[PDB]
PDB file of C-alpha atoms in Angstrom:
ATOM      1  CA  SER W   1      -8.633 -19.838  30.660  1.00  0.00           C
ATOM      2  CA  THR W   2      -7.330 -17.863  33.617  1.00  0.00           C
ATOM      3  CA  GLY W   3      -7.807 -17.597  37.460  1.00  0.00           C
ATOM      4  CA  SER W   4      -7.172 -14.934  39.987  1.00  0.00           C
ATOM      5  CA  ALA W   5      -7.505 -15.414  43.815  1.00  0.00           C
ATOM      6  CA  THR W   6      -6.545 -13.143  46.739  1.00  0.00           C
ATOM      7  CA  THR W   7      -4.072 -14.631  49.323  1.00  0.00           C
ATOM      8  CA  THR W   8      -4.359 -13.395  52.946  1.00  0.00           C
ATOM      9  CA  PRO W   9      -1.761 -13.584  55.823  1.00  0.00           C
ATOM     10  CA  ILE W  10      -2.886 -15.893  58.630  1.00  0.00           C
ATOM     11  CA  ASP W  11      -1.673 -13.596  61.373  1.00  0.00           C
ATOM     12  CA  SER W  12       0.114 -10.210  62.180  1.00  0.00           C
ATOM     13  CA  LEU W  13       3.634 -11.674  61.320  1.00  0.00           C
ATOM     14  CA  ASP W  14       2.779 -13.204  57.789  1.00  0.00           C
ATOM     15  CA  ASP W  15       3.571 -16.667  59.199  1.00  0.00           C
ATOM     16  CA  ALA W  16       1.746 -18.123  56.157  1.00  0.00           C
ATOM     17  CA  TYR W  17      -0.871 -17.114  53.664  1.00  0.00           C
ATOM     18  CA  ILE W  18      -4.229 -18.713  52.859  1.00  0.00           C
ATOM     19  CA  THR W  19      -6.202 -18.761  49.607  1.00  0.00           C
ATOM     20  CA  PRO W  20      -9.858 -19.911  49.246  1.00  0.00           C
ATOM     21  CA  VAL W  21     -10.325 -22.949  47.088  1.00  0.00           C
ATOM     22  CA  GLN W  22     -13.666 -24.451  45.997  1.00  0.00           C
ATOM     23  CA  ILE W  23     -13.841 -28.288  46.260  1.00  0.00           C
ATOM     24  CA  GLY W  24     -16.836 -30.479  45.105  1.00  0.00           C
ATOM     25  CA  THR W  25     -20.407 -30.011  44.081  1.00  0.00           C
ATOM     26  CA  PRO W  26     -22.024 -27.998  45.584  1.00  0.00           C
ATOM     27  CA  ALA W  27     -18.803 -26.125  46.393  1.00  0.00           C
ATOM     28  CA  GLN W  28     -17.095 -26.644  49.688  1.00  0.00           C
ATOM     29  CA  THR W  29     -14.709 -23.552  50.295  1.00  0.00           C
ATOM     30  CA  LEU W  30     -11.507 -24.408  52.207  1.00  0.00           C
ATOM     31  CA  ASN W  31      -8.687 -21.983  52.905  1.00  0.00           C
ATOM     32  CA  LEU W  32      -5.363 -23.594  51.660  1.00  0.00           C
ATOM     33  CA  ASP W  33      -1.704 -22.717  51.994  1.00  0.00           C
ATOM     34  CA  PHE W  34      -0.436 -22.568  48.451  1.00  0.00           C
ATOM     35  CA  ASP W  35       3.033 -24.195  48.574  1.00  0.00           C
ATOM     36  CA  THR W  36       5.540 -24.005  45.668  1.00  0.00           C
ATOM     37  CA  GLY W  37       7.833 -26.327  47.767  1.00  0.00           C
ATOM     38  CA  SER W  38       5.552 -29.396  47.678  1.00  0.00           C
ATOM     39  CA  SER W  39       3.233 -31.296  45.219  1.00  0.00           C
ATOM     40  CA  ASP W  40       0.292 -32.556  47.336  1.00  0.00           C
ATOM     41  CA  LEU W  41      -3.212 -31.035  47.509  1.00  0.00           C
ATOM     42  CA  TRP W  42      -4.383 -32.326  50.889  1.00  0.00           C
ATOM     43  CA  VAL W  43      -7.317 -31.181  53.082  1.00  0.00           C
ATOM     44  CA  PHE W  44      -8.738 -31.673  56.543  1.00  0.00           C
ATOM     45  CA  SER W  45     -11.791 -33.864  56.146  1.00  0.00           C
ATOM     46  CA  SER W  46     -14.697 -35.868  57.475  1.00  0.00           C
ATOM     47  CA  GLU W  47     -12.114 -38.779  57.749  1.00  0.00           C
ATOM     48  CA  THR W  48      -9.558 -36.786  59.900  1.00  0.00           C
ATOM     49  CA  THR W  49      -9.060 -38.264  63.510  1.00  0.00           C
ATOM     50  CA  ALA W  50     -11.584 -36.178  65.527  1.00  0.00           C
ATOM     51  CA  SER W  51      -8.972 -35.325  68.266  1.00  0.00           C
ATOM     52  CA  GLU W  52      -6.691 -33.815  65.534  1.00  0.00           C
ATOM     53  CA  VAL W  53      -9.350 -31.324  64.277  1.00  0.00           C
ATOM     54  CA  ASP W  54      -9.510 -27.958  66.226  1.00  0.00           C
ATOM     55  CA  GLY W  55     -11.379 -25.360  64.242  1.00  0.00           C
ATOM     56  CA  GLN W  56     -10.448 -26.105  60.676  1.00  0.00           C
ATOM     57  CA  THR W  57     -13.087 -26.266  57.950  1.00  0.00           C
ATOM     58  CA  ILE W  58     -13.321 -29.942  56.647  1.00  0.00           C
ATOM     59  CA  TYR W  59     -13.995 -31.347  53.205  1.00  0.00           C
ATOM     60  CA  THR W  60     -16.783 -33.966  53.341  1.00  0.00           C
ATOM     61  CA  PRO W  61     -16.567 -36.121  50.167  1.00  0.00           C
ATOM     62  CA  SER W  62     -19.970 -37.897  50.813  1.00  0.00           C
ATOM     63  CA  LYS W  63     -21.720 -34.441  50.396  1.00  0.00           C
ATOM     64  CA  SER W  64     -20.032 -33.875  46.904  1.00  0.00           C
ATOM     65  CA  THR W  65     -21.993 -35.358  43.883  1.00  0.00           C
ATOM     66  CA  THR W  66     -18.627 -35.254  41.920  1.00  0.00           C
ATOM     67  CA  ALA W  67     -16.347 -36.925  44.477  1.00  0.00           C
ATOM     68  CA  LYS W  68     -14.948 -40.414  43.553  1.00  0.00           C
ATOM     69  CA  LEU W  69     -12.874 -42.545  45.791  1.00  0.00           C
ATOM     70  CA  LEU W  70      -9.408 -43.185  43.975  1.00  0.00           C
ATOM     71  CA  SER W  71      -9.523 -46.875  44.874  1.00  0.00           C
ATOM     72  CA  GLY W  72      -6.363 -48.152  46.616  1.00  0.00           C
ATOM     73  CA  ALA W  73      -4.581 -44.835  46.624  1.00  0.00           C
ATOM     74  CA  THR W  74      -2.823 -43.522  49.742  1.00  0.00           C
ATOM     75  CA  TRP W  75      -0.562 -40.610  50.558  1.00  0.00           C
ATOM     76  CA  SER W  76       1.923 -39.657  53.322  1.00  0.00           C
ATOM     77  CA  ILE W  77       4.138 -36.478  53.483  1.00  0.00           C
ATOM     78  CA  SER W  78       6.771 -35.078  55.904  1.00  0.00           C
ATOM     79  CA  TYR W  79       7.713 -31.340  55.540  1.00  0.00           C
ATOM     80  CA  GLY W  80      11.021 -29.628  56.265  1.00  0.00           C
ATOM     81  CA  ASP W  81       9.622 -28.226  59.605  1.00  0.00           C
ATOM     82  CA  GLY W  82       9.072 -31.796  60.913  1.00  0.00           C
ATOM     83  CA  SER W  83       5.223 -31.671  60.426  1.00  0.00           C
ATOM     84  CA  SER W  84       3.409 -34.435  58.565  1.00  0.00           C
ATOM     85  CA  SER W  85      -0.035 -35.772  57.356  1.00  0.00           C
ATOM     86  CA  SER W  86      -1.397 -38.903  55.635  1.00  0.00           C
ATOM     87  CA  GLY W  87      -4.658 -40.369  54.365  1.00  0.00           C
ATOM     88  CA  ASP W  88      -6.518 -41.657  51.270  1.00  0.00           C
ATOM     89  CA  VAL W  89      -7.568 -39.846  48.002  1.00  0.00           C
ATOM     90  CA  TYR W  90     -10.609 -38.685  46.122  1.00  0.00           C
ATOM     91  CA  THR W  91     -10.938 -37.148  42.678  1.00  0.00           C
ATOM     92  CA  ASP W  92     -13.182 -34.039  42.582  1.00  0.00           C
ATOM     93  CA  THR W  93     -13.719 -30.656  40.895  1.00  0.00           C
ATOM     94  CA  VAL W  94     -11.394 -28.008  42.232  1.00  0.00           C
ATOM     95  CA  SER W  95     -11.648 -24.218  41.332  1.00  0.00           C
ATOM     96  CA  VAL W  96      -9.198 -21.443  42.302  1.00  0.00           C
ATOM     97  CA  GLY W  97     -10.238 -17.769  41.508  1.00  0.00           C
ATOM     98  CA  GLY W  98     -12.611 -18.901  38.682  1.00  0.00           C
ATOM     99  CA  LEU W  99     -10.277 -21.460  37.169  1.00  0.00           C
ATOM    100  CA  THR W 100     -11.731 -25.055  37.252  1.00  0.00           C
ATOM    101  CA  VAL W 101      -9.986 -28.486  37.028  1.00  0.00           C
ATOM    102  CA  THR W 102     -12.107 -31.711  36.846  1.00  0.00           C
ATOM    103  CA  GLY W 103     -10.695 -34.984  38.153  1.00  0.00           C
ATOM    104  CA  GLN W 104      -8.130 -33.267  40.520  1.00  0.00           C
ATOM    105  CA  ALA W 105      -6.688 -35.558  43.138  1.00  0.00           C
ATOM    106  CA  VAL W 106      -7.921 -34.243  46.559  1.00  0.00           C
ATOM    107  CA  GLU W 107      -5.934 -36.067  49.306  1.00  0.00           C
ATOM    108  CA  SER W 108      -8.101 -36.544  52.397  1.00  0.00           C
ATOM    109  CA  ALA W 109      -6.274 -36.552  55.707  1.00  0.00           C
ATOM    110  CA  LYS W 110      -6.840 -39.378  58.143  1.00  0.00           C
ATOM    111  CA  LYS W 111      -3.934 -38.158  60.404  1.00  0.00           C
ATOM    112  CA  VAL W 112      -2.211 -34.751  60.847  1.00  0.00           C
ATOM    113  CA  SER W 113       0.626 -33.800  63.147  1.00  0.00           C
ATOM    114  CA  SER W 114       0.254 -31.518  66.127  1.00  0.00           C
ATOM    115  CA  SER W 115       1.443 -28.246  64.264  1.00  0.00           C
ATOM    116  CA  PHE W 116      -1.417 -28.684  61.705  1.00  0.00           C
ATOM    117  CA  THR W 117      -4.042 -29.349  64.533  1.00  0.00           C
ATOM    118  CA  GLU W 118      -2.877 -26.295  66.356  1.00  0.00           C
ATOM    119  CA  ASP W 119      -3.205 -23.920  63.432  1.00  0.00           C
ATOM    120  CA  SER W 120      -7.039 -23.397  63.090  1.00  0.00           C
ATOM    121  CA  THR W 121      -6.566 -21.008  60.062  1.00  0.00           C
ATOM    122  CA  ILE W 122      -5.094 -23.519  57.491  1.00  0.00           C
ATOM    123  CA  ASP W 123      -7.609 -26.160  56.172  1.00  0.00           C
ATOM    124  CA  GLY W 124      -4.798 -27.969  54.007  1.00  0.00           C
ATOM    125  CA  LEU W 125      -2.117 -27.338  51.454  1.00  0.00           C
ATOM    126  CA  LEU W 126      -2.130 -26.915  47.678  1.00  0.00           C
ATOM    127  CA  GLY W 127       1.175 -27.918  46.230  1.00  0.00           C
ATOM    128  CA  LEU W 128       2.713 -26.024  43.185  1.00  0.00           C
ATOM    129  CA  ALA W 129       6.083 -27.723  42.932  1.00  0.00           C
ATOM    130  CA  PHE W 130       6.670 -30.296  40.143  1.00  0.00           C
ATOM    131  CA  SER W 131       4.461 -33.360  40.096  1.00  0.00           C
ATOM    132  CA  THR W 132       7.482 -35.687  40.466  1.00  0.00           C
ATOM    133  CA  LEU W 133       7.357 -34.930  44.192  1.00  0.00           C
ATOM    134  CA  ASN W 134       3.625 -35.959  44.685  1.00  0.00           C
ATOM    135  CA  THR W 135       3.412 -38.706  47.353  1.00  0.00           C
ATOM    136  CA  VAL W 136       0.243 -40.601  46.171  1.00  0.00           C
ATOM    137  CA  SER W 137       0.933 -44.432  45.901  1.00  0.00           C
ATOM    138  CA  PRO W 138       0.681 -46.556  43.905  1.00  0.00           C
ATOM    139  CA  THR W 139      -0.240 -44.100  41.109  1.00  0.00           C
ATOM    140  CA  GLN W 140       1.383 -40.719  41.475  1.00  0.00           C
ATOM    141  CA  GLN W 141      -0.985 -37.667  40.919  1.00  0.00           C
ATOM    142  CA  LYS W 142      -0.595 -34.352  39.133  1.00  0.00           C
ATOM    143  CA  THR W 143      -0.664 -30.937  40.862  1.00  0.00           C
ATOM    144  CA  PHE W 144      -3.528 -28.420  40.139  1.00  0.00           C
ATOM    145  CA  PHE W 145      -1.215 -26.358  38.015  1.00  0.00           C
ATOM    146  CA  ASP W 146      -0.090 -29.393  35.945  1.00  0.00           C
ATOM    147  CA  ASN W 147      -3.820 -30.351  35.397  1.00  0.00           C
ATOM    148  CA  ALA W 148      -4.802 -26.742  34.429  1.00  0.00           C
ATOM    149  CA  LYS W 149      -1.666 -25.997  32.235  1.00  0.00           C
ATOM    150  CA  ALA W 150      -2.931 -27.097  28.857  1.00  0.00           C
ATOM    151  CA  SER W 151      -6.220 -25.016  29.245  1.00  0.00           C
ATOM    152  CA  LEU W 152      -4.475 -21.743  30.520  1.00  0.00           C
ATOM    153  CA  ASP W 153      -3.966 -18.805  28.130  1.00  0.00           C
ATOM    154  CA  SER W 154      -0.139 -18.972  28.948  1.00  0.00           C
ATOM    155  CA  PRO W 155       1.452 -21.923  31.062  1.00  0.00           C
ATOM    156  CA  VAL W 156       2.340 -19.665  34.095  1.00  0.00           C
ATOM    157  CA  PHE W 157       1.235 -18.801  37.563  1.00  0.00           C
ATOM    158  CA  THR W 158       2.324 -15.711  39.470  1.00  0.00           C
ATOM    159  CA  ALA W 159       2.830 -15.076  43.291  1.00  0.00           C
ATOM    160  CA  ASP W 160       2.408 -11.470  44.511  1.00  0.00           C
ATOM    161  CA  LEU W 161       2.505 -11.848  48.342  1.00  0.00           C
ATOM    162  CA  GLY W 162       1.841  -8.772  50.550  1.00  0.00           C
ATOM    163  CA  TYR W 163       3.746  -7.467  53.562  1.00  0.00           C
ATOM    164  CA  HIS W 164       1.290  -7.424  56.361  1.00  0.00           C
ATOM    165  CA  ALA W 165      -1.474  -7.219  53.627  1.00  0.00           C
ATOM    166  CA  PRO W 166      -3.322  -9.444  51.180  1.00  0.00           C
ATOM    167  CA  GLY W 167      -1.845 -10.441  47.808  1.00  0.00           C
ATOM    168  CA  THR W 168      -2.632 -12.370  44.740  1.00  0.00           C
ATOM    169  CA  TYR W 169      -2.115 -15.624  42.977  1.00  0.00           C
ATOM    170  CA  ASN W 170      -2.856 -15.492  39.229  1.00  0.00           C
ATOM    171  CA  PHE W 171      -3.062 -18.519  36.821  1.00  0.00           C
ATOM    172  CA  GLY W 172      -2.461 -18.253  33.090  1.00  0.00           C
ATOM    173  CA  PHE W 173      -1.560 -14.586  32.655  1.00  0.00           C
ATOM    174  CA  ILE W 174       1.038 -11.855  33.830  1.00  0.00           C
ATOM    175  CA  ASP W 175      -0.735  -8.811  35.255  1.00  0.00           C
ATOM    176  CA  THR W 176       1.544  -5.966  33.720  1.00  0.00           C
ATOM    177  CA  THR W 177       0.057  -3.468  36.217  1.00  0.00           C
ATOM    178  CA  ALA W 178       1.190  -5.544  39.362  1.00  0.00           C
ATOM    179  CA  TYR W 179       4.992  -4.706  39.004  1.00  0.00           C
ATOM    180  CA  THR W 180       7.415  -1.876  38.290  1.00  0.00           C
ATOM    181  CA  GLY W 181      10.270  -2.006  35.684  1.00  0.00           C
ATOM    182  CA  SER W 182      10.871  -5.276  33.778  1.00  0.00           C
ATOM    183  CA  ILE W 183      10.621  -8.926  34.804  1.00  0.00           C
ATOM    184  CA  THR W 184      14.106 -10.634  34.869  1.00  0.00           C
ATOM    185  CA  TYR W 185      13.984 -14.403  33.906  1.00  0.00           C
ATOM    186  CA  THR W 186      16.441 -16.944  35.245  1.00  0.00           C
ATOM    187  CA  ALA W 187      17.048 -20.703  34.669  1.00  0.00           C
ATOM    188  CA  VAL W 188      15.410 -23.413  36.728  1.00  0.00           C
ATOM    189  CA  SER W 189      16.631 -26.913  37.526  1.00  0.00           C
ATOM    190  CA  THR W 190      13.821 -29.425  38.068  1.00  0.00           C
ATOM    191  CA  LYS W 191      16.179 -32.257  39.129  1.00  0.00           C
ATOM    192  CA  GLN W 192      15.030 -32.102  42.758  1.00  0.00           C
ATOM    193  CA  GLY W 193      11.318 -31.479  41.900  1.00  0.00           C
ATOM    194  CA  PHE W 194      11.553 -27.785  43.183  1.00  0.00           C
ATOM    195  CA  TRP W 195      11.564 -24.311  41.517  1.00  0.00           C
ATOM    196  CA  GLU W 196      15.428 -24.338  41.961  1.00  0.00           C
ATOM    197  CA  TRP W 197      17.424 -21.333  40.749  1.00  0.00           C
ATOM    198  CA  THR W 198      20.780 -19.580  41.304  1.00  0.00           C
ATOM    199  CA  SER W 199      20.935 -16.032  42.743  1.00  0.00           C
ATOM    200  CA  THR W 200      23.845 -13.939  41.630  1.00  0.00           C
ATOM    201  CA  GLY W 201      24.668 -12.488  45.092  1.00  0.00           C
ATOM    202  CA  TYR W 202      23.641 -10.169  47.945  1.00  0.00           C
ATOM    203  CA  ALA W 203      24.103  -6.868  49.642  1.00  0.00           C
ATOM    204  CA  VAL W 204      23.501  -5.821  53.368  1.00  0.00           C
ATOM    205  CA  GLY W 205      21.860  -2.474  53.712  1.00  0.00           C
ATOM    206  CA  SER W 206      23.616   0.213  51.726  1.00  0.00           C
ATOM    207  CA  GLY W 207      26.764  -2.109  51.476  1.00  0.00           C
ATOM    208  CA  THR W 208      28.509  -3.180  48.298  1.00  0.00           C
ATOM    209  CA  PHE W 209      26.992  -6.089  46.325  1.00  0.00           C
ATOM    210  CA  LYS W 210      28.875  -9.385  46.617  1.00  0.00           C
ATOM    211  CA  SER W 211      28.841 -11.319  43.404  1.00  0.00           C
ATOM    212  CA  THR W 212      28.449 -15.060  44.422  1.00  0.00           C
ATOM    213  CA  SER W 213      26.242 -17.951  43.173  1.00  0.00           C
ATOM    214  CA  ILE W 214      23.548 -19.030  45.754  1.00  0.00           C
ATOM    215  CA  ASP W 215      21.525 -22.083  44.599  1.00  0.00           C
ATOM    216  CA  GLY W 216      18.139 -22.258  46.359  1.00  0.00           C
ATOM    217  CA  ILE W 217      14.329 -22.838  45.877  1.00  0.00           C
ATOM    218  CA  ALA W 218      11.446 -20.384  45.471  1.00  0.00           C
ATOM    219  CA  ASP W 219       9.120 -21.744  48.266  1.00  0.00           C
ATOM    220  CA  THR W 220       5.897 -19.846  49.184  1.00  0.00           C
ATOM    221  CA  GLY W 221       5.254 -22.512  51.872  1.00  0.00           C
ATOM    222  CA  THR W 222       8.308 -21.524  53.973  1.00  0.00           C
ATOM    223  CA  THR W 223       7.981 -18.295  56.133  1.00  0.00           C
ATOM    224  CA  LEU W 224      11.648 -17.161  56.296  1.00  0.00           C
ATOM    225  CA  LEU W 225      14.806 -16.749  54.075  1.00  0.00           C
ATOM    226  CA  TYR W 226      17.263 -19.528  54.666  1.00  0.00           C
ATOM    227  CA  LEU W 227      20.727 -18.787  53.294  1.00  0.00           C
ATOM    228  CA  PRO W 228      24.404 -19.961  53.809  1.00  0.00           C
ATOM    229  CA  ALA W 229      25.839 -19.238  57.292  1.00  0.00           C
ATOM    230  CA  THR W 230      28.553 -16.842  55.756  1.00  0.00           C
ATOM    231  CA  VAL W 231      25.757 -14.632  54.262  1.00  0.00           C
ATOM    232  CA  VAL W 232      23.520 -14.770  57.362  1.00  0.00           C
ATOM    233  CA  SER W 233      26.506 -13.883  59.730  1.00  0.00           C
ATOM    234  CA  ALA W 234      27.327 -10.879  57.393  1.00  0.00           C
ATOM    235  CA  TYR W 235      23.718  -9.735  57.675  1.00  0.00           C
ATOM    236  CA  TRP W 236      23.316  -9.995  61.496  1.00  0.00           C
ATOM    237  CA  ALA W 237      26.819  -8.482  62.152  1.00  0.00           C
ATOM    238  CA  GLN W 238      25.169  -5.066  61.023  1.00  0.00           C
ATOM    239  CA  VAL W 239      22.515  -5.274  63.883  1.00  0.00           C
ATOM    240  CA  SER W 240      23.970  -4.326  67.452  1.00  0.00           C
ATOM    241  CA  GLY W 241      23.209  -7.072  69.921  1.00  0.00           C
ATOM    242  CA  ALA W 242      22.199  -9.733  67.336  1.00  0.00           C
ATOM    243  CA  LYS W 243      23.246 -13.224  68.137  1.00  0.00           C
ATOM    244  CA  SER W 244      22.571 -16.991  67.168  1.00  0.00           C
ATOM    245  CA  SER W 245      20.770 -18.611  70.114  1.00  0.00           C
ATOM    246  CA  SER W 246      20.950 -22.386  70.239  1.00  0.00           C
ATOM    247  CA  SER W 247      18.074 -22.320  72.947  1.00  0.00           C
ATOM    248  CA  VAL W 248      15.809 -20.365  70.761  1.00  0.00           C
ATOM    249  CA  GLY W 249      16.767 -21.958  67.398  1.00  0.00           C
ATOM    250  CA  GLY W 250      18.320 -19.163  65.303  1.00  0.00           C
ATOM    251  CA  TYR W 251      19.414 -15.561  65.197  1.00  0.00           C
ATOM    252  CA  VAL W 252      17.562 -13.071  67.630  1.00  0.00           C
ATOM    253  CA  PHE W 253      18.022  -9.403  67.946  1.00  0.00           C
ATOM    254  CA  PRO W 254      17.073  -6.651  70.318  1.00  0.00           C
ATOM    255  CA  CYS W 255      13.354  -5.617  69.584  1.00  0.00           C
ATOM    256  CA  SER W 256      14.592  -1.910  69.854  1.00  0.00           C
ATOM    257  CA  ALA W 257      16.733  -2.363  66.691  1.00  0.00           C
ATOM    258  CA  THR W 258      16.155  -0.820  63.274  1.00  0.00           C
ATOM    259  CA  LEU W 259      17.045  -3.618  60.801  1.00  0.00           C
ATOM    260  CA  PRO W 260      18.917  -3.053  57.500  1.00  0.00           C
ATOM    261  CA  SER W 261      17.568  -4.096  54.137  1.00  0.00           C
ATOM    262  CA  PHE W 262      18.809  -7.269  52.249  1.00  0.00           C
ATOM    263  CA  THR W 263      19.300  -7.380  48.573  1.00  0.00           C
ATOM    264  CA  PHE W 264      19.456 -10.495  46.461  1.00  0.00           C
ATOM    265  CA  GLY W 265      20.563 -10.712  42.731  1.00  0.00           C
ATOM    266  CA  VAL W 266      18.523 -12.147  39.848  1.00  0.00           C
ATOM    267  CA  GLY W 267      20.837 -11.980  36.915  1.00  0.00           C
ATOM    268  CA  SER W 268      21.879  -8.338  36.640  1.00  0.00           C
ATOM    269  CA  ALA W 269      18.714  -7.275  38.470  1.00  0.00           C
ATOM    270  CA  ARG W 270      18.388  -6.680  42.271  1.00  0.00           C
ATOM    271  CA  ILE W 271      15.481  -7.307  44.685  1.00  0.00           C
ATOM    272  CA  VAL W 272      15.461  -5.214  47.858  1.00  0.00           C
ATOM    273  CA  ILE W 273      13.882  -6.732  51.038  1.00  0.00           C
ATOM    274  CA  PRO W 274      13.160  -3.795  53.457  1.00  0.00           C
ATOM    275  CA  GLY W 275      14.479  -4.314  56.955  1.00  0.00           C
ATOM    276  CA  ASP W 276      10.900  -4.378  58.491  1.00  0.00           C
ATOM    277  CA  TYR W 277      10.194  -7.548  56.489  1.00  0.00           C
ATOM    278  CA  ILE W 278      13.045  -9.279  58.490  1.00  0.00           C
ATOM    279  CA  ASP W 279      11.400  -8.660  61.932  1.00  0.00           C
ATOM    280  CA  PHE W 280       9.333 -11.802  63.298  1.00  0.00           C
ATOM    281  CA  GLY W 281       8.607 -10.131  66.707  1.00  0.00           C
ATOM    282  CA  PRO W 282       9.116 -11.219  70.337  1.00  0.00           C
ATOM    283  CA  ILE W 283      10.466 -14.886  70.774  1.00  0.00           C
ATOM    284  CA  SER W 284       7.728 -15.169  73.512  1.00  0.00           C
ATOM    285  CA  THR W 285       4.951 -12.832  74.557  1.00  0.00           C
ATOM    286  CA  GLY W 286       6.424  -9.660  76.241  1.00  0.00           C
ATOM    287  CA  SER W 287      10.039 -10.544  75.427  1.00  0.00           C
ATOM    288  CA  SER W 288      12.432  -7.816  74.267  1.00  0.00           C
ATOM    289  CA  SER W 289      14.325 -10.493  72.171  1.00  0.00           C
ATOM    290  CA  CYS W 290      12.912 -10.623  68.637  1.00  0.00           C
ATOM    291  CA  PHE W 291      13.240 -13.492  66.050  1.00  0.00           C
ATOM    292  CA  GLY W 292      15.038 -12.768  62.790  1.00  0.00           C
ATOM    293  CA  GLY W 293      13.610 -13.455  59.459  1.00  0.00           C
ATOM    294  CA  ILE W 294      16.959 -14.344  57.728  1.00  0.00           C
ATOM    295  CA  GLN W 295      18.322 -17.640  59.121  1.00  0.00           C
ATOM    296  CA  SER W 296      21.042 -20.183  58.347  1.00  0.00           C
ATOM    297  CA  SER W 297      20.321 -23.109  55.887  1.00  0.00           C
ATOM    298  CA  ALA W 298      23.303 -24.951  57.211  1.00  0.00           C
ATOM    299  CA  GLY W 299      21.154 -27.756  58.986  1.00  0.00           C
ATOM    300  CA  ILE W 300      18.628 -27.990  55.997  1.00  0.00           C
ATOM    301  CA  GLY W 301      20.784 -29.047  52.974  1.00  0.00           C
ATOM    302  CA  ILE W 302      19.191 -26.492  50.656  1.00  0.00           C
ATOM    303  CA  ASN W 303      18.890 -22.636  50.509  1.00  0.00           C
ATOM    304  CA  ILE W 304      15.201 -21.471  50.678  1.00  0.00           C
ATOM    305  CA  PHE W 305      13.867 -18.221  49.278  1.00  0.00           C
ATOM    306  CA  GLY W 306      10.706 -18.290  51.406  1.00  0.00           C
ATOM    307  CA  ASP W 307       7.929 -15.676  51.916  1.00  0.00           C
ATOM    308  CA  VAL W 308      10.423 -13.079  53.445  1.00  0.00           C
ATOM    309  CA  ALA W 309      12.184 -12.880  50.089  1.00  0.00           C
ATOM    310  CA  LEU W 310       9.245 -13.544  47.687  1.00  0.00           C
ATOM    311  CA  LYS W 311       6.914 -10.954  49.227  1.00  0.00           C
ATOM    312  CA  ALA W 312       9.494  -8.280  48.131  1.00  0.00           C
ATOM    313  CA  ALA W 313       8.894  -9.225  44.366  1.00  0.00           C
ATOM    314  CA  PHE W 314       6.316 -10.132  41.817  1.00  0.00           C
ATOM    315  CA  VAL W 315       7.297 -13.737  41.006  1.00  0.00           C
ATOM    316  CA  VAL W 316       6.591 -15.575  37.729  1.00  0.00           C
ATOM    317  CA  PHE W 317       6.545 -19.443  37.822  1.00  0.00           C
ATOM    318  CA  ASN W 318       6.869 -20.235  34.098  1.00  0.00           C
ATOM    319  CA  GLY W 319       5.766 -23.788  33.415  1.00  0.00           C
ATOM    320  CA  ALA W 320       6.720 -23.845  29.643  1.00  0.00           C
ATOM    321  CA  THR W 321       8.521 -27.048  28.307  1.00  0.00           C
ATOM    322  CA  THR W 322      11.760 -25.526  29.759  1.00  0.00           C
ATOM    323  CA  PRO W 323      10.594 -23.954  33.079  1.00  0.00           C
ATOM    324  CA  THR W 324      12.007 -20.548  34.267  1.00  0.00           C
ATOM    325  CA  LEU W 325      11.403 -18.101  37.172  1.00  0.00           C
ATOM    326  CA  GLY W 326      10.873 -14.353  36.744  1.00  0.00           C
ATOM    327  CA  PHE W 327      11.335 -11.628  39.334  1.00  0.00           C
ATOM    328  CA  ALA W 328      10.221  -7.933  39.234  1.00  0.00           C
ATOM    329  CA  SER W 329      10.290  -5.191  41.818  1.00  0.00           C
ATOM    330  CA  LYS W 330       6.774  -3.874  42.884  1.00  0.00           C
TER     331      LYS W 330
END
């Protein structure tokens, strides 16, 4: 089997991407944030505290003839941005782009933090990291990809995120028309439950490539590129008037600037992030200070290849017995 679904930016900055997902019988279509940095499929629901729902589409398990309460099971998750959600669990039929999994754990939110309430465009998350991070207690649950894997033509999914444009998530096949040149594969550590890999270095604009190992995670659920403070300082030193602002919470730059590209290594191959991908616009409406899309990881504890980096590439998440990542230019 295979599946193919279009993913669409939620706003003019590509702050996140939503993908339609069918849940239940008859289908209830919710727009979920596909997140390769977490392992829970959770949804706004008929159980969500009424004051914490503001325009999201909700899953109503009582209207699905295939929903079953997973008796006793609860979940609770906290993300790197400080947001959180918790609730109880159902099993139900879940389909993405024509690919169907029966008995998928659908985590129904009773509580969500304010950042979720305030974002009317995201109806929940679909996690695509390793199932070892799944938060369901007392019986940990499998991701949609882990449940689908055995049925797929090939045990892979691919992320092809657009810059200010829709893109695609494919399950079970590699679309050889979606990228240029060849795919370069690189080793993965699953020891922290993430798609963790080691970049071979970087360049700033037309500058020389610096060979240096940068361990980090491929994370579609994180907007920005978070790298060591040395690398980030080297990038922003090429932009006149750029500075790190403690009041704003990272590097800002004059909105009048033209930004340089940023290149990252994947083995002997190179992925080039155009400068425009690094512009996240005014810090507040009407400001001439603009927020940068490359930020320091120093206060996180891990480097994060988020959407800014991944949208420059066609990315293969290879779930074979020894997982690997693949990157191509496009």
